Amino acid sequence: LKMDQALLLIHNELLWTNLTVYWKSECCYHCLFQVLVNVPQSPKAGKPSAAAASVSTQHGSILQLNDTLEEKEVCRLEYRFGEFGNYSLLVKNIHNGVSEIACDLAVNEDPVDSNLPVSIAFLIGLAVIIVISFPPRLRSVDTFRGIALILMVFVNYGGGKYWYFKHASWNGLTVADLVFPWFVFIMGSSIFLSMTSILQRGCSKFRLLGKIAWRSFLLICIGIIIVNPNYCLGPLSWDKVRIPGVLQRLGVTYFVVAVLELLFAKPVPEHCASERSCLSLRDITSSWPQWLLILVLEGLWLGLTFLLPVPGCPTGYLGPGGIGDFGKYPNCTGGAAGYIDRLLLGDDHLYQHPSSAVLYHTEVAYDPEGILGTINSIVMAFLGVQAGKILLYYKARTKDILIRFTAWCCILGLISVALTKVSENEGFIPVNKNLWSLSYVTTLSSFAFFILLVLYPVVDVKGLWTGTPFFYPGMNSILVYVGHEVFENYFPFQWKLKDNQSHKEHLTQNIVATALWVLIAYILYRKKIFWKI
Template identity: 60%
Template structure:
């Protein structure tokens, strides 16, 4: 922690345990020299503090032996904090973290995170991201060949269908926390926009060139290059949601003064909500109104032998038609999950164009979780109550009629239907609530072992794809029909990536794009 002061007399900085804990005498931390007015340099001093317990910082002046400021705070591990002390006429102003406050005595801290330099990192976000990633890796490696670790053939959910939208959700939450903090620490919007464009470009490029399942068709060439993909969808979704947030975010995340304070995390961003609603209207219109050759309008089925074989070449309805029309059949995923059960022969891409609209909606709902965290900072009860409200699945219940097949819009991961998005976001809000309560509020759980891959998610995701067929992540099995052997191999491979991420975490190596 660094202290800076424009005072003309030296100051002493001392610390003690928080008053709610057993009383302790103040311990001297640092001597802050007076500022040099001729060089216009404030006096500075750097100190290290214990983060295990809350502390009380006391700043006093050697002139008159008077206390200037007392701040109570629980500092986060590996945080970087600045305590700024100013003289405003005859009063003293202190700021811990963000210099945007206006009170004459402000003890509201805004700590710095590793990645953006402004807020204490919420371990629950990394834990949630890591949990999603670990399940994703296990599923991609085979999930022990159990059916519930395979994607649902069409409508419905399995464990495998949960993790990707959760990953998108947390990406949206991180956007809300990161963009505001970068602006608070002096980055211009143009500079932040360049970072957004670059990160999106790199994610899309990595998805097309490095993580491309059409490698199995032979050497990668334009003739069979799969254009959509997981990283491509993440990159484009990030671009849209981050750019949208950048237009309306403010350097400070203070409370909104309006007629409806209970909606302060929504109403200030009504243009964003209009944009998202328009996007969703586009998805609904294209899905249900676009004419598809030789298919009924608004068809949401798998084709093949589904629907008694009436529409064998209509897999995915408008979503499949748009992809085949704009991308070409050879540039799509060639083995959709619907082919196993419904014997559909048409290429269909679960990361296609139309579904990307709803992945943007999913990330935007994650962005909403981030806004809640910002607006109600240091108020965990408010944050958790808002998460509970957003976790109520009324919209999903209406859209699906609480059934798998009979609803207006069934839950479908291949289509990324709006009911799928609303259901997954409800799950995400509730799961984030539980992790937030255990990790950041009560501190009963450190987040391990999911915290470690969550902090190196891009490296783990790309690494597990690239090295999937190499030892020790894969080896020849004695009995390829044995669940036990598959489970052992898949758990071993997944555990190895958790260990790798832990080693990188210990060495402070984090791959950021």
């Protein structure tokens, strides 16, 4: 018995009905019934036949008995199983009245509760906090980036082998999905904050364009050579290299938004601040040509995804392949993004095993961070640029900045509610990390606005907290990222586990590895070593 399983042995007593047991989870959307076990017929009178099977306990189970010769369903039960439990399903015949078939399930051994280590760890963290309590840079931006870094290091090392510290298979939001867009939002803000400071004191655009180009080139080089390939399985060879990647995506969106802001730059007006609703939206109207291009790119993304003809697959398709959507479309994982990507780069230059495979059973390859999602990344980086413009235009009165942050958060939350139709698998556009939906960027940017609204009158102005954890990694992000990608298997971060089937046994190791990375970040702050790409 492995993790998230429960031995289910079935006893069948009926004289002459050879039985089939089917299975399907409760979360899987429009999924066919596969097979679990085929119990044998009662060989002799009063000596029932028995079979053994294993059922997953991560989500609820639907179990169907359907016979072998015929189709009439003998029984169905829908129930939820706990980890490492002897459960006993009995199917019998009811003597009273007409002949009837009934199923009774009895627990032999009780299961084991699995959220106890999470509870214990979070109370111990609260107790430790209770014992502990008794060209300027901006503190709030650095604090938020540090929180994103500790979440990324913890989730990428290991979630404790938990399903809610892991990317969802399709059409869902978890703790793991939240981390990546916030980096893009911070990156756009940092673009505006750096660029306004360099253009002042005297500089040339010809000077700055080389810097932008060189940064983009270096990021594209670092991702392909170092981060992507697995160098334990063999020497690197072309026709087997993965070109799409996270650093290439960051580099291309950085190049586009940086050049686009550099072309249309205007000096910041003095005494720009006014009372609320009396500004005349001067921050908005100073960016008049650059909004139009972003609208054209979003119109292109909508039109391409919904209306492009694709051979074999339906023309606009958002669902998974394989078993999902009833196995009518057994390829078509990507849709119109997958066809575009599988006509230019190739099919061998893509990520072989996607997240959707484990539940939806899709054979064909998909890349989470490839082509046609870059447009939405540019849109969200522009939103971060918009936040950065707000901070430097109106920084006389605190009340003004809070009003803009509140209004922007409410309007983005309203559009993401209206598009999502407040569900998970329904609506015009669902929220999905793999396709980089407009709903996805629209819901996480509102959370970023709310988090900045909470932090700014505490960590940055009129201090009530020193923000002491979470800016020490914030200053050095690229060292931490390359460090955990290169040094992942080394001894202080990882060691051999003498029980491989415990959530409890993994969680402490991942927590210690995250704490060690925070300690390394703290040592480098005191030694005043900062590296910037």
